[model samples]
Target: MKQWSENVEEKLKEFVKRHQRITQEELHQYAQRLGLNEEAIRQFFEEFEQRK
Candidate 1:
């Protein structure tokens, strides 16, 4: 099974690639679509730097 951090990182990378800039609201929507917590998604992105 993939670790939670790995899943979060994958989601973050996918979001960054799909959208030029992912906002808090967008991240929240993604979390909803992925059945995850908005705050957790937000925190992950906030803590991790986007790879350009």
Candidate 2:
């Protein structure tokens, strides 16, 4: 929770490595469950789009 950005960052790296090509909306929903905040979610999508 406290390190949500860091945690999401690491998770995103794994997703990229695994080639998990899900949509931004889908990842948003998953991140909601994963308890990421708006800033973290924004960071995720920012990185995801670039990586994808």
For each candidate, what TM-score against the reference? Answer: 0.50, 0.56
- Report the C-alpha displacement of residue 8, candidate 1, in angstroms: 5.5
lDDT of 2: 0.66
Q: What clash pairs does model 2 have?
A: none
Error of 2 at 3 (Å): 5.9
lDDT of 1 by residue, 1-52 (tens): 3324556557666776556967778667766676566556655666666634
Q: What local distance difference test score does each model get? A: 0.63, 0.66
User: Can you write out model 2's per-residue Cα lDDT over 1-52, one digit (the tens) per residue?
Assistant: 4537566667765654566566777767766776667787676666656875
**In lDDT terms, which candidate is top?**
2
* Model 2 worst lDDT window (10 residues): 12-21
Please list the residue runs of candidate 1 whose C-alpha ends up more than 4 Å from where it truly belongs after superposition: 1-8, 50-52
Worst 10 residues of 1 by lDDT: 1-10
